Design a protein around this ligand. Structure first.
Ligand SMILES: N[C@@H](CC(=O)O)C(=O)O
Length: 414
């Protein structure tokens, strides 16, 4: 409780809890009595997970309403077309590379990391037609509460475009009312951010508890796959950086070395801060240094940062393959491309704050193939959750660099 605790700024603090916990969990004989560590520690971690889920739902709604309504109807045009194409193609290629890398490493298992035995293939997922139908909400509040992310996305975009056509109308009462509504929702969003900042400080203890249980449960071989898949992701990320950007910058006429030189400044703050939003003003400064047009970067940067996320999509595909191979599941081609589409939609919906990235994974699993209710699935989810902390660090810099690439390419064409 003592203030100095909250005064230590180092995000390295989290890693402290990562290390100190694992050691204790690693010591099976004198400390790692599975039953006692289980009963005592597990709830401290479930508390962190439970708290983490709370942040997700309203942030999506408020951020999308404000951003879409303020940004898109105003500038809507061919610039929007090129940007949308770029973002969607990048998401697709990112998930493609994640799949290819899971094929290359095969990180998931040497022997089934979950106990298997009841790995029997899951209940068949619905065909694509009903998935696409679901994207539109059968009822807004009913689907909002129950626990569905995407239809809230739809409804929010709708409401925002509506308001934006609205405020321009003549009658003053209408303009005033719309303004008040918008401001209220924006205030809600700011509040949720302020809460995120706080939760981050409790996070370390939860990391400590979760990883301690993970280590003490299975012991030595949980770290064999864990690092393997870890590297599988990191390489998969670097490739995305090298091939995608160097090609594009090369094609349109920027020498990539100087580009990354310039970006390193923002990438440092993205990696260590573990958050995408605060970098956005740093991104605007970097663009002003990069030689990019004001209206274009002012339109694109917020919209890209909220909408477009590629590194997280690769992380989700690779984590999905991890789960599948740990459970004792093997994925057919149709299921693979279905994962492609579903992960595209999930990366689109993703929130944009540190931990949220894991949560949307639960969506893809539920949308296709493996349901979450099977205990082995949650068991492996627990293993993922720990390393997610470090993986997010590189995912942040990847996403920011991709958005910068998009804006600089568009501006260079014009
Ligand atoms: N906000 C994270 C992703 C996430 O947590 O969903 C990032 O930018 O890397």
């Amino acid at each position: 409780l003592y203030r100095k605790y909250i005064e230590y700024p180092v995000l390295q603090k989290i890693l402290i809890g990562l290390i100190l916990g694992a050691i204790v969990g690693l010591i099976l004989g004198h400390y790692g009595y599975a039953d006692a560590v289980k009963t005592y520690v597990k709830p401290f971690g479930d508390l962190f997970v439970r708290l983490l889920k709370m942040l997700v739902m309203p942030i999506v709604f408020a951020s999308l309403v404000v951003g879409a309504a303020s940004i898109s109807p105003a500038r809507l045009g061919r610039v929007g077309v090129k940007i949308v194409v770029y973002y969607l193609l990048t998401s697709a290629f990112a998930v493609t590379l994640g799949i290819i890398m899971a094929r290359l490493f095969n990180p998931g298992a040497g022997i089934h990391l979950a106990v298997g035995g009841q790995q029997f293939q899951p209940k068949q997922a619905p065909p694509l037609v009903k998935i696409l139908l679901d994207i539109v909400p059968t009822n807004p509040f009913g689907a909002l509460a129950n626990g569905q992310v995407c239809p809230t996305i739809f409804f929010a975009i709708i409401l925002g475009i509506a308001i934006t056509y609205l405020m321009n109308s003549e009658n003053e009462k209408v303009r005033k009312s719309a303004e008040t509504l918008l401001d209220a929702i924006n205030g809600l969003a700011e509040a949720m951010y302020k809460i995120v900042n706080g939760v981050m400080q409790y996070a370390p203890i939860g990391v400590f508890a979760l990883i301690a249980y993970v280590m003490a449960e299975q012991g030595v071989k949980v770290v064999g796959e864990l690092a393997k898949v870890t590297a599988a992701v990191y390489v998969g990320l670097t490739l995305q950086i090298l091939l995608v950007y160097f090609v594009l910058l090369k094609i349109y006429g920027i020498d990539p070395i100087s580009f990354i030189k310039k970006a390193k400044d923002a990438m440092l703050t993205a990696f260590v801060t573990r958050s995408s939003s605060g970098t956005l003003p740093v991104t605007m400064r970097v663009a002003k240094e990069m030689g990019i047009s004001e209206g274009i970067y002012s339109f694109t940067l917020p919209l890209g940062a909220t909408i477009n996320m590629d590194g997280t999509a690769l992380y989700q595909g690779v984590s999905t393959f991890f789960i599948a191979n740990a459970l004792g599941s093997h994925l057919t081609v149709g299921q693979q491309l279905t994962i492609v589409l579903t992960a595209v939609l999930a990366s689109i919906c993703t929130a944009g704050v540190p931990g949220a990235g894991a949560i949307m994974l639960a969506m893809v699993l539920e949308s296709v193939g493996l349901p979450l209710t099977d205990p082995n699935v949650a068991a492996a989810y627990a293993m993922i959750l720990g390393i997610d902390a470090i993986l997010d660090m590189g995912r942040t810099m990847v996403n920011v660099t991709g958005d910068l690439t998009g804006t600089a390419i568009v501006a260079k064409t014009e």
